[PDB]
Design a protein around this ligand. Structure first.
Ligand SMILES: CCCCCCCC(=O)OC[C@H](COP(=O)(O)O[C@@H]1[C@H](O)[C@H](O)[C@@H](OP(=O)(O)O)[C@H](OP(=O)(O)O)[C@H]1O)OC(=O)CCCCCCC
Ligand SMILES: CCCCCCCC(=O)OC[C@H](COP(=O)(O)O[C@@H]1[C@H](O)[C@H](O)[C@@H](OP(=O)(O)O)[C@H](OP(=O)(O)O)[C@H]1O)OC(=O)CCCCCCC
Ligand SMILES: CCCCCCCC(=O)OC[C@H](COP(=O)(O)O[C@@H]1[C@H](O)[C@H](O)[C@@H](OP(=O)(O)O)[C@H](OP(=O)(O)O)[C@H]1O)OC(=O)CCCCCCC
Ligand SMILES: CCCCCCCC(=O)OC[C@H](COP(=O)(O)O[C@@H]1[C@H](O)[C@H](O)[C@@H](OP(=O)(O)O)[C@H](OP(=O)(O)O)[C@H]1O)OC(=O)CCCCCCC
Ligand SMILES: CCCCCCCCCCO[C@@H]1O[C@H](CO)[C@@H](O[C@H]2O[C@H](CO)[C@@H](O)[C@H](O)[C@H]2O)[C@H](O)[C@H]1O
Ligand SMILES: CCCCCCCCCCO[C@@H]1O[C@H](CO)[C@@H](O[C@H]2O[C@H](CO)[C@@H](O)[C@H](O)[C@H]2O)[C@H](O)[C@H]1O
Ligand SMILES: CCCCCCCCCCO[C@@H]1O[C@H](CO)[C@@H](O[C@H]2O[C@H](CO)[C@@H](O)[C@H](O)[C@H]2O)[C@H](O)[C@H]1O
Ligand SMILES: CCCCCCCCCCO[C@@H]1O[C@H](CO)[C@@H](O[C@H]2O[C@H](CO)[C@@H](O)[C@H](O)[C@H]2O)[C@H](O)[C@H]1O
Ligand SMILES: [K+]
Ligand SMILES: [K+]
Ligand SMILES: [K+]
Ligand SMILES: [K+]
Ligand SMILES: [K+]
Ligand SMILES: [K+]
Ligand SMILES: [K+]
Ligand SMILES: [K+]
Lengths: 326, 326, 326, 326
């Protein structure tokens, strides 16, 4: 049995290789790179930026003082005023660099009127400070706000099922929202993933074949409050048209389900994903209800969410047979 | 009479239960959790973060001084310089922690060149400071900018109505914008919400059945300046096709109306919602006008918005009867 | 001649009145309110917030000192240490409040270990400071980034025209981009705006009737590099179907054109708008070219953008006549 | 051979001219202008803003002191207290302006209770400081987050190809994602770019003619994990319908390909673009595979991405011939 293109948790199961021009591409797309790495690397990357700027200006300030001879008389006196009060060592230069760029500015170490190069540096570093701060806030806010994380509160059922609804034979998976905050402009997709050879003898290692779930009358758009059971009507235009309970129980393919919507707070699109191998599809089954009424409101019991119950009355032939007979 | 799936104000009326894996899911989706709680909890959550960092570093600084014996001679002298000038108590350590991380840095309490562990902490805390600040700005900006709040300046009419337009029998609700700022890419949806049993005897506790309002020619897209009256043409493909004034006045169902659009300033999608129980639909009625002209401009009088007037000339049979006769 | 629903610049020409519940709605939707007012009001609103917090804490600090008797001995001595060094007046209390919340912290005026109420306030105010700062950055960034402003670099032609293209009679306006940065997911709409009475004798003060420009094959989606001339094919399904050059030159209606797209940098949707009164439509005309080639690249001369030239060969009857004959 | 409308890298190849009203339009749309210029100009623009504010308030403070006679006795004494301690020069005034607005506030130079004009300025400048800071963060974050940069990690194949698939003759280009982070709501477009003269003898310098790739059944929507090969079915409704291998090898036109999608982290739409001149299209060719299986996962070898292999069995007539015969 051929292994799965996307895992049940939604993760895609492909490795890329021989992209060999990538680090220049990742550099040109640096932000996308940057917000996708691990917090700890993004953070210490920003830490390096601070250290580097702090050392650099510390060093410049130290030079200025070393050369102005302030290391000898740091506090000044009548008839000698240093560039920056109280920079005596390099530690004291670095302290001043930190205190200025952070804008902590304790004051013991302090710029003077004397050297306009000392002043110019405090000006440059103030601006450099803002710049870096700004990159950081931006990076952190972006990373913080990533809507992929919202998929963790959207749930696909563990199994698909096939079964009859209103005279038609249908593939059915279920989706639900685990928060009271909505999924705006929510809509849904599906695809059949098997390899195939064309009549022109072309080999497609994994062709993706649409699994119509209502796009053409906008019935793929959903208003997901309580769980919805999605329906693919298996008919002449479906790629399960001629697939019967028998075929399925020996067949080798994958169904990929996608729910896309906007996280309500940020209106940023999330993409939730899951998958169903042929072997995870329960022919002749139906989902137990979760929605039931109460005096004032309805309620959804999420225990039953994944649970199916068998409908032995269900045809076992393909939907094609089922028409080529009737 | 069965209670309502969504309230008139737009609020959905369902409780979730037996989600029992949720707190790990809410943790993994922490931001979404965080921006959806109540201001006061988000705020004091960020306050805790400050206090905790402030106490923690205060404590570290106190230790360093306690052990360096700075608590005895805080100001230093010739031949003794403490790690941090003027930390004598723990209160004074906490003050220094606050002053550094806030970057207030009054200066009375002040790091020195002496102990590089003192210096390292001021470096770590400066960076930790930025990080936390950044989370806060992000959280607050996000919460601030939530477009759900925009639904408070979009208005649905209190009643639907059925009535005749250009030879066809139509469901009609009304929507309007209460701001001069627009709703971009605005478009609209509707759904019939009743339970139902399938011919395969399946029970759907609340099926959602589309209420076509023009999707197929993009006539669901609106340019909402003055109020628009939305039209569902009740025809063979409608689920009100065979529903007459009589049926309605004893029927039990809910119509759910949605207006989705982008708040102009932020281009973030809002989702406005309301509902109409069968009992809120006025068969044989029509909305009073609100738009009228003036010398230079038009004007909308919002008093008339909700008001209907009866059209006794209106057929009382279903749209099906109305064709199965003619 | 009836005045125009939307001006040429894109501005809508309607006044709202007898919204009388609005200030509570505008309060609940405060952000949307806030970012839509005039810079100077948003700014001084944020200034008030500062002043108010600064006065408030200044006042609290003054009280604390007044009562601790620090106004008498501000600097302290052996055997007396005030809550906050150097607060002697209220001016000095306000200075301390400003210096702390701004985080300037000059230090002359400075909190001590003595009074934990003094300390608690510095803690509260630091956090209050961050909060307000955060609202401000958020507000300012949002206002700054509003994509409506992008419509100022999108241009509609001053006139529509009717004329023949590939055997069909067509309404044609022109759009163009005045920046080298793109308009992503750009697409376009149109509407006929006249009042009308239904056969059921209903009066619609301004009905909006779609002006198909390719929605059904996604031909309303454009890739706007050089100017595009938009086409409404006037055919049996158009509401200009039976409208001839004569009718137009005495008719009374408005055509509203919309171009929606995402500003490239921010991917926020802008909505550009213009209008054409019947009297602004040039029957039997065509736009002069703007695009011409060069050795290496193409070029658009924007002078010709608006200019039409007459095609006297153009039929003068309606597109209906033009078929009811042939 | 006529030069190309859009380069292979995606860049559009048009110059605008005789926009002569533009600088007022670019000013009204200042943000869009601002975030699109070069980092170094955006940055030094913000630097100017600082300098200007710093000089301005420095100057005001200097005046106040000059006139209060503080330049003579800067430190004060019993019976004389200056507006701002220690402003003796203009350098010292500028230092104070910088220290206040940056909020560094070293403290040596320091506002007093004495002059309420001195105090008022520190208040105004604090607020002015925040404002400018806010513009900067906003500008920098926006520029930082531009999703156009994401196109650098989306790849189009260097060549299109024509070839047979499942009985139909098809144009085929290939797209792929170079990151493991997805492209949400990804979908794709295409256009034929040649000049043309209408039967009414109208000259369109570059008409854009849609190249259907599945829009009508939403098959233009893709789930791009491994590379996808896009298909234009060349049939009666295509503008390559009557184009044969011969025509192509002497023809003069350009095909423009677009992939639009949302960068996963930010959910901001990117627009990737490339182009194929008639001369870059390989009649009778097919892409080498890149996807192959492994024990646990699949893998994509990106070396083969661009590589084609000839299928000599491919018809050489147009798809029209190919039907007008059969
Ligand atoms: C806070 C420390 O987290 P840390 O620095 O270790 O980085 C995160 C952590 O390692 C998760 O395990 C990552 O993967 P996933 O969550 O397992 O995918 C997560 O990815 P994403 O959160 O960057 O996607 C990382 O951010
Ligand atoms: C400022 C203090 O507000 P506070 O901390 O009490 O929290 C808000 C307040 O309680 C409203 O009543 C909440 O619900 P709604 O407005 O009744 O839904 C609102 O929800 P949302 O604003 O978080 O949605 C809360 O933010
Ligand atoms: C900077 C000072 O600008 P100021 O405080 O005077 O406010 C802006 C100015 O008054 C424009 O005239 C306003 O209208 P428009 O530009 O004429 O619509 C503009 O609206 P919008 O920019 O708020 O839309 C205002 O922001
Ligand atoms: C950091 C310094 O970069 P600098 O100030 O020189 O500006 C960037 C640099 O010049 C690139 O070459 C620009 O063009 P592209 O990248 O060649 O288009 C880029 O455009 P975009 O990054 O502004 O688009 C500029 O931002
Ligand atoms: C930055 O993140 C890096 O991105 C690379 C670029 O995608 C990855 O390399 C991946 O892609 C490369 C493309 O050739 C291969 O060489 C590597 O084996 C493969 O791990 C690599 O893991 C990862 O640290
Ligand atoms: C964080 O917000 C929490 O989210 C929970 C998770 O949704 C809610 O519990 C809700 O959902 C749980 C899921 O089993 C139930 O146990 C609770 O009764 C129900 O109030 C709970 O109110 C709320 O404070
Ligand atoms: C905040 O902005 C305010 O919004 C109001 C609410 O829209 C406007 O009043 C407008 O709307 C009101 C609704 O009744 C009318 O009373 C006013 O005449 C009309 O100017 C008013 O101009 C404007 O300052
Ligand atoms: C701001 O960026 C500017 O934008 C102008 C406005 O687009 C450009 O001028 C361009 O457009 C003008 C419109 O007439 C022409 O005069 C110029 O030659 C042409 O370079 C110009 O390069 C560029 O610095
Ligand atoms: K400071
Ligand atoms: K300070
Ligand atoms: K969309
Ligand atoms: K500071
Ligand atoms: K200080
Ligand atoms: K269709
Ligand atoms: K700060
Ligand atoms: K944002």
């Amino acid at each position: 049995c051929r292994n799965r293109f996307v895992k049940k948790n939604g993760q895609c199961n492909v490795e890329f290789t021989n992209m060999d021009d990538w680090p220049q591409r990742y550099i040109a797309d640096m932000f996308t790179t940057c917000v996708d790495i691990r917090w700890r690397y993004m953070l210490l990357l920003f830490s390096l930026a601070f250290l580097v700027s702090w050392l650099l200006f510390g060093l410049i300030f130290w030079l200025i003082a070393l050369i102005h001879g302030d290391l000898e008389n740091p506090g000044g006196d009548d008839t000698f005023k240093p560039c920056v009060l109280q920079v005596n060592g390099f530690v004291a230069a670095f302290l001043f660099s930190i205190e200025t760029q952070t804008t902590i500015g304790y004051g013991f170490r302090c710029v003077t009127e004397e050297c306009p190069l000392a002043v110019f540096m405090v000006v440059v570093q103030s601006i450099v400070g803002c710049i870096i701060d700004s990159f950081m806030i931006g990076a952190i806010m972006a990373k913080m706000a990533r809507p992929k994380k919202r998929a963790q509160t959207l749930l696909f059922s563990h199994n698909a099922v096939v079964a009859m609804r209103d005279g038609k034979l249908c593939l059915m998976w279920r989706v639900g929202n685990l928060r009271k905050s909505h999924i705006v402009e929510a809509h849904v997709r599906a695809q059949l993933i098997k390899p195939r050879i064309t009549e022109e003898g072309e080999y497609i290692p994994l062709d993706q074949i649409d699994i119509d779930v209502g796009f053409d009358k906008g019935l793929d758009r959903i208003f997901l409050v309580s769980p919805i059971t999605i329906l693919h009507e298996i008919n002449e235009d479906s790629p399960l048209f001629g697939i019967s309970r028998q075929d399925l129980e020996t067949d080798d393919f994958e169904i990929v389900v996608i729910l896309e919507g906007m996280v309500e707070a940020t209106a940023m699109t999330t993409q939730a994903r899951s998958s169903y191998l042929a072997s995870e599809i329960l022919w002749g089954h139906r989902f137990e209800p979760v929605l039931f009424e109460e005096k004032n409101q309805y309620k959804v019991d999420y225990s039953h969410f994944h649970k199916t119950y068998e409908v032995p009355s269900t045809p076992r032939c393909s939907a094609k047979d089922l028409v080529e007979n009737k």
